[PDB]
């Protein structure tokens, strides 16, 4: 339990939803991020990605 | 470090801080500012108490500087933001708070000066004979007293105690069959330091087991359902796990157990053995003593000896002194009204 609710609770890839606009909702829920746990620490990524 | 919201501080303002801010901005002389700074520290979070005056005067170390100089300055300080500030005795507090009624208050000014200045000591109980003293009658005096009762006391408006200081509990006592059951709620160098963590992680799991354990033995030592708590000695908890008394009292002193009644964790292990064959230690003695003294004295019996006889009738072997002394304490009106 602490691992699962740790993930969904707090995590770079679980964020509060953009709730102004429908279209804000939508575009939040189809978004592809390069950041997080799996990679791309940023400032060090470089200009090619 | 910086660039983050480290808990650097807030710099809040208390009452003495604010009073001193108010002194900074008023036309005091070099000396009068020293008397003012001398008084504002004497003030308390409660307002009214400016403690002893003649120690304020004598604290300056003579050399002239009479009483009247501290008296005037004192009045002006008493006049700053929270209306009545400091002064003494509450009487002069209500005279300073009553100093500004705008003077356009009907019936209130005079009557209020008489009641508040003098004879206010007899206004505690009720009007009665005071009605004959000031010749007032009916609601003329009652409306003035409505104003006097409408004043409030001192400061405690500055406050600056937003911190409620909550308990946070420690171990939860889930109530079972008319009792309680514990659950306890709520490169190579630093790698060797990692190992210490393994021991700390192993002790962290047993930390709840100590709370549930000592909590279970504590539930077995004292009956929950019974009035107050059954008398126990630290020798019982020291008998169970064979731990030292001071250690157990330290764990119960630091952490606080949350049961359904009481937040009250180290008070559940402290009791007396009474040293008597006929018999809940001092807990039910003082508790039930104040409870028996709660309903009593149809008018003004004020008899602690009768309460001592009632305690002796229960089989507790009262000394008529100890029982009366412990019973009359903690704001108890007993023996005071006689």
């Amino acid at each position: 339990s602490a691992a699962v609710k740790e993930f969904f609770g707090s995590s770079q890839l679980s964020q509060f939803m953009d709730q102004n606009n429908p279209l804000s909702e939508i575009t939040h829920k189809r978004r592809i991020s390069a950041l997080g746990p799996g990679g791309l620490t940023r400032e060090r990524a470089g200009f090619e990605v | 470090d910086d660039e983050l919201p480290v808990y650097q501080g807030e710099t809040t303002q208390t009452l003495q801080d604010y009073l001193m801010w108010q002194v900074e901005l008023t036309p005091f002389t070099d000396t009068d500012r020293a008397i003012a700074t001398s008084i504002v520290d004497a003030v308390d979070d409660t307002g009214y108490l400016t403690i002893q005056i003649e120690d304020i005067v004598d604290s300056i170390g003579d050399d002239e500087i009479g009483l009247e100089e501290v008296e005037a300055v004192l009045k002006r300080i008493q006049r700053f933001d929270p209306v009545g500030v400091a002064a003494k005795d509450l009487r002069d507090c209500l005279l300073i708070q009553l100093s500004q009624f705008a003077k356009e208050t009907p019936w209130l000014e005079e009557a209020r000066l008489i009641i508040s200045d003098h004879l206010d000591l007899l206004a505690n109980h009720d009007f009665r004979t005071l009605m004959r003293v000031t010749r007032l009658k009916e609601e003329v005096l009652k409306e003035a007293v409505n104003l006097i009762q409408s004043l409030d006391x001192x400061x405690x408006x500055x406050x600056x105690x937003x911190x409620x200081x909550x308990x946070x509990x420690x171990x939860x006592x889930x109530x079972x069959x008319x009792x309680x059951x514990x659950x306890x709620x709520x490169r190579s160098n630093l790698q060797e330091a990692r190992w210490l963590i393994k021991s700390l992680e192993s002790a962290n799991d047993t930390l709840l087991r100590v709370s549930r354990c000592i909590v279970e033995q504590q539930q077995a030592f004292f009956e929950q359902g019974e009035e107050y708590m059954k008398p126990m000695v630290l020798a019982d908890i020291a008998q169970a796990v064979e731990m030292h008394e001071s250690t157990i009292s330290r764990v119960t002193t630091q952490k606080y157990l949350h049961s359904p009644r009481g937040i009250x964790x180290x008070x559940x292990x402290x009791x007396x053995x009474x040293x008597x064959x006929x018999x809940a230690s001092s807990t039910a003695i003082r508790a039930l003593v104040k409870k028996l003294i709660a309903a009593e004295n149809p008018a003004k019996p004020l008899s602690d000896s009768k309460l001592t006889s009632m305690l002796s009738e229960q089989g507790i072997m009262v000394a008529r002194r100890t029982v009366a002394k412990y019973r009359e304490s903690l704001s108890i009106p007993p023996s005071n009204q006689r």
Binding site: - | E3, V6, Y7, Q8, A193
Partner: protein, 251 residues
């Protein structure tokens, strides 16, 4: 302020690992030499004339057993930082600087003509300055005033320890344990490891860099130290230096 008394004087990593190393180039030793022999490792033979061994040299522990076997006494080698204090204490500035300038006069290659000038301008600075070189490795460690280490009070009460406090707690634990084992008259191995551990501790309280990992099991991060404590951006940018946040302002 405050102060804490250290059993075995250690570290001060601020010197020595700030390149170049003043302790290294002052004593004519490589920083791998002194860095290696500060904690544990070599015994750093000091003084000890009338033998095979020279004044500033090191050796392996097996070579020390062979040394005490053949030479016995008249070889004095202190394994902890006390040999750097001893060597460092025995350094005579005037004569060494003078003979080094003289030696510089007849030199040829520009390589050896540079280092030497570095040592002249350094040691000379210690002479005209009036500092004793001994002071570099420190004995009494001063502690920072309480209010500028505040305690980071919590949501429910029950204050939690700040970042800089942990370093002081740690150093104090190792200082008391090294003192306890030192007054116990115990083997040189375990008190040795305590000397090592305490130089690690003080060097970790002055800079969490210098070597690797540092941090904690708190979620880690390097923590911060008194070096890191220097004004946000490690310049005095923040807080001071053109950067006060300010009053009667709005936006």
């Amino acid at each position: 302020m405050g102060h804490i008394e250290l059993a075995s004087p250690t570290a001060h990593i601020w010197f020595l690992k700030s390149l170049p190393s003043r302790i290294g180039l002052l004593l004519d030793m490589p920083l791998r030499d002194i860095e290696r022999v500060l904690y544990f490792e070599s015994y750093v033979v000091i003084e000890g004339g009338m033998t095979n061994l020279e004044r500033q040299q090191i050796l392996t522990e097996e070579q020390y057993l062979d040394a005490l076997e053949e030479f016995g006494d008249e070889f004095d080698a202190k394994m902890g930082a006390e040999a750097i204090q001893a060597l460092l204490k025995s350094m005579d500035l005037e004569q060494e600087c003078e003979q080094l300038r003289e030696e510089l006069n007849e030199t040829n290659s520009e390589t050896k003509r540079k280092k030497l000038t570095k040592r002249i301008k350094l040691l000379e600075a210690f002479v005209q300055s009036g500092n004793k070189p001994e002071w570099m490795i420190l004995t009494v460690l001063p502690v920072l005033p309480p209010d500028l280490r505040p305690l980071v009070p919590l949501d429910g009460g029950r204050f939690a320890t700040s970042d800089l406090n942990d370093l002081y707690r740690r150093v104090i634990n190792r200082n008391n344990r090294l003192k306890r084992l030192l007054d116990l008259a115990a083997p040189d191995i375990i008190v040795r490891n305590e000397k090592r551990m305490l130089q690690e501790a003080v060097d970790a309280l002055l800079d969490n860099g210098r070597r690797g990992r540092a941090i904690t099991g708190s979620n880690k991060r390097p923590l911060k130290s008194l070096a890191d404590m220097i004004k946000g951006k490690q310049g005095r940018f923040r807080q001071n230096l053109l950067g006060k946040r300010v009053d009667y302002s709005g936006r």
